[PDB]
Design a protein around this ligand. Sequence first.
Ligand code: NI
Length: 376
Amino acid sequence: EGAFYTREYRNLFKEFGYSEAEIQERVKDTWEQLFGDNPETKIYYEVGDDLGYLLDTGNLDVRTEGMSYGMMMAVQMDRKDIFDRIWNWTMKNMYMTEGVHAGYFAWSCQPDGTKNSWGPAPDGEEYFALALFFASHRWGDGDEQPFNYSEQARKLLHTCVHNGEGGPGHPMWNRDNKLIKFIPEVEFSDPSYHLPHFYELFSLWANEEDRVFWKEAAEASREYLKIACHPETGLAPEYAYYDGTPNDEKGYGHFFSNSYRVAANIGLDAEWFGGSEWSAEEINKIQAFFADKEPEDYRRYKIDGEPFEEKSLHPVGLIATNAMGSLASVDGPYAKANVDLFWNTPVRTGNRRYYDNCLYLFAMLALSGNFKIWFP
Ligand code: NI
């Protein structure tokens, strides 16, 4: 039974023999390397007294993926100061009041706040919403907008479901199949965006008129991952059609950066809402696939496992996600090896560090029993 029910979170590092003191130290150190004055590893930058952002180092921009991640990290770490800095920057610079995506958040901005696009990225929105609910529950709603966290969350999820009913906009979920979309104007998806464990919580906390929908989306997403993951290797494509098969029209049909998150998501869903035979077997497949492969040699792979010449752009993120997946198969043949590999992998430095280090901190939180549900 999941932590949602027991309110006890598995400390998998501890269960696998790491000391409580060393785990505590490693979690704090990871946070400090990302959010403190450690220029080589840092991804969070403070602006003035009331702003802050996470920098996508690989593209020199600020993304809703990163900002929503940073808010989730901040609430998990009980850092309202950092949470509010990031959320303030997000509302000031990213929230759109004009155009077909009014009510959503521009997916990419320059560090100065200028929007690079008026298109949103749904995986940002869903992380903003849950981070905001958690903020409301840990700290209480603030008296001034936009710090009325729970209202902001419910408003945002309203738009995600209902956009287009009163205007030219489009929803971020397909209303018929209850699946999250890659972007509002397309009819295909991205397996890594599927967060059934978030949707379960939305089914308790969103506007009441959408609570049944959110339960249905949770179930739809669990079913969708079964068809999207390769049956032998467990590998999911970056983009996939609603039928579960890869969308490779622009090269996103393979196992690469986006896909890494699928294992992590399965891990966290198992911890929060309970294990399943499917999830255990799926993590066992991915870990089996990587068992005989060196991190230095990790590639892009077709989902059937065929390797490309191209190396993984984010091999540390791949390590972190595979290790976080162990929460879904704690007795799995490779579960300990994956957790140990992660323990022995430092936080990343250099221009490509942002994505790896985000996945890294999520894995550190989850594997130490510190990626929690914050209830009202
Ligand atoms: Ni120590």
